Design a protein around this ligand. Structure first.
Ligand SMILES: [Zn+2]
Ligand SMILES: [Zn+2]
Ligand SMILES: [Zn+2]
Ligand SMILES: [Zn+2]
Ligand SMILES: [Zn+2]
Length: 376
């Protein structure tokens, strides 16, 4: 009977897909990119300072069923996971932070201040929202320092009555276990749709890949490993099957693709790009059923005993960069031969979906859809 993160990873997966479809329904002409694990962890942390329905609503909102699993194990699970995710010091640049900002006019509960800081290794600051421009600068300064300037001016303006603000961000850049030759990267066409074309740098390599064409999903399924036990899963939907692919993704199916270990020879064309997702959590989580904590009825007596408090603003920003880089230090020479037959062509020159997974812990680090590679 030891604390484990094994129990919640399945639900994190379901949460990834729930949020994804919600966003995919709102618009289908825009890129989608977010971190399931980051968002879930922040709110799992927040819940510790809430009580009653407000509390039960947050967890249910993250796809948990309080009868299916004990409340105590949900919290321990996120604590373990965080200690595993919050320090994968291999050569996978993964910086992620949680920053809480509360008005100086509130008497805060110690216990809460200690959990966020010692257990969840997150930040809790007091600020004077009386001076909006000053408060704003403090929030942005924090995120800029944490991302090393990789993320600036996240907040544009604070509301007059802002009393509690949450900021979650994450940045990622990996190294392929098997690099692409920078030389082969050439400018090709990316077909946004029948009449829209975008010029983009296309990486490419002919080789053996863990690739398979799933008839259930009507799509090509490609897995590529990063150094640091992180696995990228790309999905290239057949003509007119983007929606079917989106509606059919479930955690059970992902678990299966990861069992395939057979390789195949293919010509792969993958765009070189950088995408970012920026979302107003109050707006998106509200649709998923998480509303109380953002309302006047909120029960945050775990944060401040008697004062009427509510989460005024919550933002999430995710940034990912993908290129041909792999094993640094010099060109570790690989071997490339000529096929006996013409291998299949798998070009990601049209809208596609991808998912990033920590092979170790099996948690969904990222999920997204690229409709336009230059809409970064
Ligand atoms: Zn609880
Ligand atoms: Zn710790
Ligand atoms: Zn202003
Ligand atoms: Zn379908
Ligand atoms: Zn080719």
């Amino acid at each position: 009977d030891h604390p484990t993160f094994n129990k919640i990873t399945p639900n994190l997966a379901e949460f990834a897909f729930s949020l994804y479809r919600q966003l995919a329904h709102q618009s289908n002409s825009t890129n989608i990119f977010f971190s399931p694990v980051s968002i879930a962890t922040a709110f799992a942390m927040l819940s510790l300072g809430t009580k009653g329905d407000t509390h039960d609503e947050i967890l249910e909102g993250l796809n948990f069923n309080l009868t299916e699993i004990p409340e105590a194990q949900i919290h321990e699970g996120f604590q373990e996971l965080l200690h595993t995710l919050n320090q994968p010091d291999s050569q996978l640049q993964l910086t992620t932070g949680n920053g809480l900002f509360l008005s100086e006019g509130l008497k805060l509960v110690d216990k809460f201040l200690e959990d966020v800081k010692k257990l969840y290794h997150s930040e809790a600051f007091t600020v004077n929202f009386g001076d909006t421009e000053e408060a704003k600068k403090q929030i942005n300064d924090y995120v800029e320092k944490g991302t090393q300037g990789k993320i600036v001016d996240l907040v544009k303006e604070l509301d007059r009555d802002t009393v509690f603000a949450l900021v979650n961000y994450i940045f990622f850049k990996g190294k392929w276990e098997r690099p692409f030759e920078v030389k082969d990267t050439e400018e090709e066409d990316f077909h946004v749709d029948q009449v829209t074309t975008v010029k983009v740098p296309m990486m490419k390599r002919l080789g053996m890949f863990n690739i398979q064409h799933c008839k259930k999903l009507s799509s090509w399924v490609l897995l590529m490993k990063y150094l640091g036990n992180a696995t990228a899963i790309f999905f290239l939907p057949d003509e007119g099957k983007l929606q079917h692919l989106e509606n059919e993704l479930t955690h059970d199916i992902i678990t299966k693709f990861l069992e395939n270990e057979d390789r195949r020879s293919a010509s792969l064309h993958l765009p070189k790009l950088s995408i970012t997702g920026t979302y107003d959590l109050k707006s998106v989580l509200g649709q998923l059923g998480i509303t109380k904590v953002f309302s006047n009825g909120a029960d945050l007596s775990g944060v401040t005993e008697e004062a009427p408090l509510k989460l005024s603003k919550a933002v999430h920003k995710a940034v990912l960069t993908i290129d041909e880089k792999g094993t640094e230090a010099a060109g570790a020479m690989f071997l490339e031969a000529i096929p006996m037959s013409i291998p299949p062509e798998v070009k990601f020159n049209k809208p596609f979906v991808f998912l990033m997974i920590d092979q170790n812990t099996k948690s969904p680090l990222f999920m997204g859809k690229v409709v336009n590679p230059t809409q970064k």
